[PDB]
Amino acid sequence: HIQPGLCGLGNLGNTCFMNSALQCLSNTAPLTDYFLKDEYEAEINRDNPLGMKGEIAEAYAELIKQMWSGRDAHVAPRMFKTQVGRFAPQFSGYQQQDSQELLAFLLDGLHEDLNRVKKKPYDANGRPDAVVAKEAWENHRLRNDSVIVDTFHGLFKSTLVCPECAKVSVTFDPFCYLTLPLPLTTVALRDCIELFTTMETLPWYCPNCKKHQQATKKFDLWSLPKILVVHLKRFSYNRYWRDKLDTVVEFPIRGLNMSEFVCNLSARPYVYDLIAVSNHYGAMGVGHYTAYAKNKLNGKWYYFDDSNVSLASEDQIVTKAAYVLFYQRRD
Amino acid sequence: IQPGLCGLGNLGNTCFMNSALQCLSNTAPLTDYFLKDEYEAEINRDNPLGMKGEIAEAYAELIKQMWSGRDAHVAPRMFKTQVGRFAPQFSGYQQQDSQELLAFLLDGLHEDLNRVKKKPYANGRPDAVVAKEAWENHRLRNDSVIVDTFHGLFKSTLVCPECAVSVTFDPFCYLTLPLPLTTVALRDCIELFTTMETLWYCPNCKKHATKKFDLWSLPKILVVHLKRFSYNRYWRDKLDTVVEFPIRGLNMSEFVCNLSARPYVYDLIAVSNHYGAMGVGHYTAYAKNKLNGKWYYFDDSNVSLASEDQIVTKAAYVLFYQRRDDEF
Amino acid sequence: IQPGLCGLGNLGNTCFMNSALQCLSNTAPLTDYFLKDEYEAEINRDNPLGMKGEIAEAYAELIKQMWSGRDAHVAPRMFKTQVGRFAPQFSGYQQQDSQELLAFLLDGLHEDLNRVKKKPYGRPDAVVAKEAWENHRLRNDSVIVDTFHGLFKSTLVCPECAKVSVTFDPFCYLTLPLPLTVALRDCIELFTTMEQQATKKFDLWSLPKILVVHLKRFSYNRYWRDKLDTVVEFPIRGLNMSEFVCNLSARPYVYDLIAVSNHYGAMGVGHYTAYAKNKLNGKWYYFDDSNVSLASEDQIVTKAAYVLFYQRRDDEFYK
Amino acid sequence: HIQPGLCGLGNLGNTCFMNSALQCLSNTAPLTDYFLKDEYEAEINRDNPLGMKGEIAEAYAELIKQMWSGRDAHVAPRMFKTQVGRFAPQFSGYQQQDSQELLAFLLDGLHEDLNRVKKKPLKDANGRPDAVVAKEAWENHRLRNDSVIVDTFHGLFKSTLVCPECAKVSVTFDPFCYLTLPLPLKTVALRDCIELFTTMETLQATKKFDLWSLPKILVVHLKRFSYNRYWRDKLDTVVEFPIRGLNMSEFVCNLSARPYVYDLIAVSNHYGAMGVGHYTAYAKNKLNGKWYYFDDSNVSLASEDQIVTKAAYVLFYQRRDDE
Amino acid sequence: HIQPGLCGLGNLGNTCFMNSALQCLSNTAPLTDYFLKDEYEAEINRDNPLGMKGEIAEAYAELIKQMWSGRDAHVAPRMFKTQVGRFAPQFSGYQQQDSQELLAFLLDGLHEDLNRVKKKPDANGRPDAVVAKEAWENHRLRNDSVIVDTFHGLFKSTLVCPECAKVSVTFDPFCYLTLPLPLTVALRDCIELFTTMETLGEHDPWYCPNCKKHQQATKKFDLWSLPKILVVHLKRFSYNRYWRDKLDTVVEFPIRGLNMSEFVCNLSARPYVYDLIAVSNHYGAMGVGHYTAYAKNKLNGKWYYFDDSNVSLASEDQIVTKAAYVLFYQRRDDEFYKT
Amino acid sequence: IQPGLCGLGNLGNTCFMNSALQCLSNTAPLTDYFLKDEYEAEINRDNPLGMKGEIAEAYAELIKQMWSGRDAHVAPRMFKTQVGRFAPQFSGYQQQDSQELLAFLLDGLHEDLNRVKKKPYLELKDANGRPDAVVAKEAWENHRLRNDSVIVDTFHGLFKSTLVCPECAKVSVTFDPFCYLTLPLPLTVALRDCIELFTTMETLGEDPWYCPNCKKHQQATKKFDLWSLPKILVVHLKRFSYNRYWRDKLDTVVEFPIRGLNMSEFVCNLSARPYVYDLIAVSNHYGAMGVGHYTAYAKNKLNGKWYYFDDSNVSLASEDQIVTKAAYVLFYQRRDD
Ligand SMILES: [Zn+2]
Ligand SMILES: [Zn+2]
Ligand SMILES: [Zn+2]
Ligand SMILES: [Zn+2]
Ligand SMILES: [Zn+2]
Ligand SMILES: [Zn+2]
């Protein structure tokens, strides 16, 4: 029969953005394995006031089992589409959609529906970064503990400097994806990462001023997850229209060394390999989303264009169409 | 940007429209008519069968944008709006048909550009005499750039089963070819269309037959619609049969019953494609650029260089052929 | 505020409805019937052709508001809601037709107030017409029949056979075709001119207390609506209908104008207004949605005139 | 044929508010002349993050060319209406609309779609003269905003705040493209409304507005509407305004400034007491100098004695540039 | 923790008509057992031109498994409602709905989505037994499903031409009985009214083969063979131009031992004794209106009232009221009823 | 037909409205006010916080129909239309809340019938360390200088709020009016347990209180106290929790008296006359999931019997049916003597 995971997703009326994001998540082996192991039932959180009563996790679990059964070449994700439209109506209709916006929604929704914290409970003052980061991560896990935290969550350092009182505010914050700005001739992914970590003048509230100030902000990468989701910020949502950057960003297929951008000098080496890409086409109108993904069982690359699954070659993956990159850490 | 290499943005389930529009855009006698920009005197705003010249004007405006060489892609917003206003069946989010839109547009453009300001209003006689009469009568009601570009004549012979022969010559602006009841040739579908098939209100007997179609005269631009869709109670079915059609040198003289007629050799200029089978579905187009002679693939906003070896597939739904004219 | 001098607020493209409602408001036999407030016994809630008495009730309520003398204008929200519920085609911001709403309302009010609880299933013209009218009233008996219903003769002459088939049919308004400034009598003559396969000629037999004359200005084409802008000259006083009445033993028929439904707007959605003569003071007013202003007779006859309301003179005794 | 500019606009379902605003702008000669000269194509800004990719300027230019061709007595502004409802869906509703709200949208929209500043780059002046601080404020405004809209409708007003504790006088100069005038409480003159706008409000500091520089085209919005939680209120006060010779010089603070005499060119009118209401316009035709009444598709000759009524909502004045 | 089958259905905005019909079908044991035993999987027909590509059968199977799992006290039938609306959009409006109209749609839909026939291929003066056997066999050569096996019966149609006096007899299948109500009545009076001869009205005249003309012929129905599950629809609604009328007549019907044998014209037929299993109820008359259901649980033999999401224990004395609209009867198949 | 025994037709998911309307209909001081038909002089059409008198007029018309004795049921079309026009959130086929409608209607009726034609502005006195009796009297008088209507006279009470800052230990005491009490349910319970829980001190969570001495949003302690109670006490049992993606519902059986509810022990004011209440109406909710359904129990003022109002259907009830998990909003009438 059909090879497991080589399953297209039927377009049900401008759901290409959803399908693209779903193919990327489907080919995230730690996440697919978790659901296929079918022991996640004990972790479904139906009372969580921030979740969807376990219903997003259940519709997702059902769909992945279909996609990895080896019985179908394609499935129509009707239950999943219905559940998304019910909890997040902004994803329904026939206007311009965003694979990253849906991805952010799904990563948060799966996390709360599978959150092991049944009751959520409820300040760097020149202390070492290692101490402040450990504290921030532990406090994060006291509120958020799931397969999503274990697979996609990392930690970044935020430094804010007030222009009035010159007070330097350092915080450690979790992330489940990295939104990379593109420079304003092709660019390298490392240039986009360096741009993300370079200081920029913003507005946030200063605790000493008590007012909103146009403070400088600098990001630093502290710890990185098993699955690094890299969002290339191509879209600009202006008041009356959406802009798109068509720049070719060169990104490695294999051996992405993240270690040079990690400010923790005592940290483990971070080498990553590409597993999936969410692609966008269409300078004008609604546009279209597809995906490249590496099948975990045979190690080959494929193109997923809604219901159509075709064998791909690595030389096709790096184009201006690349929008969201999925990287898996080599452990 | 090269003129005519202009993608059309999808405005929400508008692929059916964009596909049809790319085929019409790459119909040189029609595009040249609008780009010559002298058609303003021919806009018919009083025609009771037209859309007050508004479909012709929205189409003229879009073509000028598509052939300006200023844009790589255009969102056909005014055109989409005007279509939805006059023909609301094309504005839902349900499955659409590139041919249904094409038939609407060909009729609408004809009426909005009909030179006839006031429309006025057979038995054992020679075919040549009856055909000349039917055509002259047609142009006394219908005279436009659409009649000049796409209209042909087909002979219809109906034989009564009780009293035993009614011959009529009727115009057409496209040919809907039935597919046989898997790879078939275009010529087999043409032969199927012209074969006598028993099913009409007869005047001699009055007891309401063996209908037979014949091709009499063919136009500059022959639009060939392959009847792939069928409509079941709860869903639309699609025939996925591969129809083999020539890219160059389609000899239609072979199927023309007028033996004194001019030779009819056609070359492919555009194809409306359909993918999806029994699911939601998507339309694209192949079109040969009149200025550089190369084949391009138009997938909504995206325009990419194509090769001839990609064109003949099960995806081919509507074929556009241009007649070879060397002092005929 | 003088009773009846009440404007109707526009509730989003509802001027067509207000224009129609102002003409009916200023039809004295109909308004008096609702103000008399004894019509409650005549509301037919089981009629399969009616709206369970709900259009009559919404209309009665609105007319009482319009003739109370307490308001200069009212927003006919309940009426608009009830119309939109039973006839959803009258909902939206597309081009509307005041005659289409009028025809709906005249039929609706008739069925909601129909006294017939269970509808049953070579002679001289006078005998056949009397029979046709009595049979019509055995199915249809209401204040609308009493105020607006007339009878017209249909003569069909068969060729080859030469058989003359005569029928008498009721009407509650006359749709008059326009020729091609024209006179109303030319449009009446055009309606009565002769046109299996046979010749058909309309003739007017008996005419009602309130004659509603619809000038067929609109042509609904496949993709657009056409409009005839011809100035139709119609009398304000003394319309003699007697010359078009084929019953030679019939009473004289002289009418006086009481209301006009007006339409403006060459392109787009357009706008409907009304001229109406107030029954209590005899003056002409212009009803433009919520605005009611004193009018002069010299303003009434224009290309804007679309539907004319005429009241028969029952002054001198006839038969 | 038809006289250019005497073109009605068809109602496309509750679009009278739009037609009224459009007739006022159509009869603003410096703006219509700019589009009819048809050289504005080089000024269309398609990359502006605050614009509509040039599409509101293009839909407006196309419509104004139709209205001033002399070929049509009326046009249905379908493309314009469609583009407006696409960028600003609040105007594509079915509820009571505001011609001033559409005007403010369109003035900003046209400015951004025609903004000469391709890359946009709070300063307080301490003890410096008003003339120096105002010149600075205007130059800084034009470094961000440079269009036919700035050149036609933009003025500058002075804002003075004085602290009741330390007696500190804080002066700022801010641009405007129209004046929203409050109407008095307890028939009023336009000058009373202007004086009310420039009178010091006790507000914990006192705030006073002053007119510094005035544009070629002065748009005066009479604040008739009050948007309450469940309903909109309307002031029916008759505001007396001059048709010719409005002397604005008395309200201008720059005492070294040029005289400011204005003539009325257009009025946006509003009617209706109970329902959706209706908008029309009075406008002076620039080619024959006569007054006309534009009621959607209908254009009729008007007289000066008809303009000043309670219906007057938005007034358009044109400065006399005699020398 | 919850008893299987005692599962309410959430209202998803005017869907009470749908919940009511679904509770009746859910409590039809031969149909529920078919889905719970996974007998449906191999029989899903996806190419049938008269079906919904197996999608209505799949959505129904999934829902019935949820209702009979014993895990939920109530479920929101979102997937089912979505699939129904997609194939039959008339059921997704906010206008008044009809549980019988949904039932007829669903019985036909499931039949076609589960039809074992993958490729679908006068009778005068002959005995009724011969013609009926032929009509049934020809029916099953086209229609072979769990729906045919559970709900299909056969009725005799006699048409008599008023001109040539030609008597045309046909045997036609049915999956429910629409009973006209007389102009408190007994169910047997409604059955007798259904089998009484009536003269045809326009625009449905009978085409006479002798006359070769459309005729105002007489039409008489007779019951020939009855199914395991007899669905009896009391025709309470009248669709008028501007509103829907409703007959509020109390129809007295048995809860147990309904003897159908007296209305069966086949004298050699097996006895037909039926017990009520479910009732689709309607309240509201000519106003908006609400649908509920009475159903007998197959595992404990008790009567329950299903009012959307709410399931409560009922008593037999509550069942026979003016609210009864659609009745579900189950035939007795013991040693007492041999053929 | 007995007056007041009038059902309300459902006009498409309007059960939430009919339930609230049946409770208000059977509030004798309010129905008597409209039936006396002298309220016309009190309709406030200029109030910027009202609906130009239109909600009061639509309500008056409906209550006269329901108490005429001519109809067994009425379709409240004008009322539903007016509600949908001023508050569009109450239209549609999604889950509704009878208390949300009730709160809207109580405020709308108050503003449409507000005797204060021009609302004044006066500073609220510091009320620092002064006796509770003095500060409460001041708060009530200031409330009536802005709000004076049949709604204030029938449903308004006063509650005391004590806020204590965790940084500066500042004790802020205020008295605020209420037209209903939202009672929290413990995380079968008695009504008195929910009343006691409403007056227990709680610490504000992740909604802090602004402090005047700190000049910052502080997570202070908040304690409520009942000061004065109205003629008609509307008790809202807080069963629903509106979470980001779903609505939670507490199905706890709250035991509440039908007769003799002694409120005096929960009133921190001792100068008040005893407060004894009797149940007059209950708004009920059914439907664990989906859209759900609302009905009402109500005691007829003319015959003293209990009835069940399920949209258009009105049937005789027994007291033993009223106290169930379905009870959501309770209407209590004070004993006067
Ligand atoms: Zn600071
Ligand atoms: Zn024949
Ligand atoms: Zn004859
Ligand atoms: Zn100071
Ligand atoms: Zn016969
Ligand atoms: Zn403090």
Residue numbers in the entry:
A (entry chain C): 296 to 417, 422 to 483, 774 to 791, 796 to 924
B (entry chain D): 297 to 417, 423 to 465, 467 to 483, 774 to 791, 797 to 805, 808 to 927
C (entry chain E): 297 to 417, 425 to 483, 775 to 789, 806 to 929
D (entry chain F): 296 to 416, 420 to 484, 775 to 791, 807 to 926
E (entry chain B): 296 to 416, 422 to 483, 775 to 930
F (entry chain A): 297 to 483, 775 to 793, 795 to 925
Sentences from the paper on this structure:
USP4 features a large domain (~30 kDa, named USP4 insert from here on) inserted within the catalytic core, which carries a Ubl domain. A tandem DUSP–Ubl domain2526 is located at the N-terminus of the protein and is separated from the catalytic domain by a connecting linker. In this study we show that USP4 requires the N-terminal DUSP–Ubl domain to achieve its full catalytic turnover in vitro.
The two fragments were coexpressed and purified yielding a minimal catalytic domain (USP4 D1D2). There are six molecules of USP4 D1D2 per asymmetric unit with equivalent conformation (root mean squared deviation of 0.7 Å over 344 Cαs, calculated with SSM software). Superposition of the six non-crystallographic symmetry-related molecules of USP4 D1D2 shows flexibility in the zinc-finger ribbon (maximal Cα displacement 4 Å), suggesting that it can move to accommodate ubiquitin.
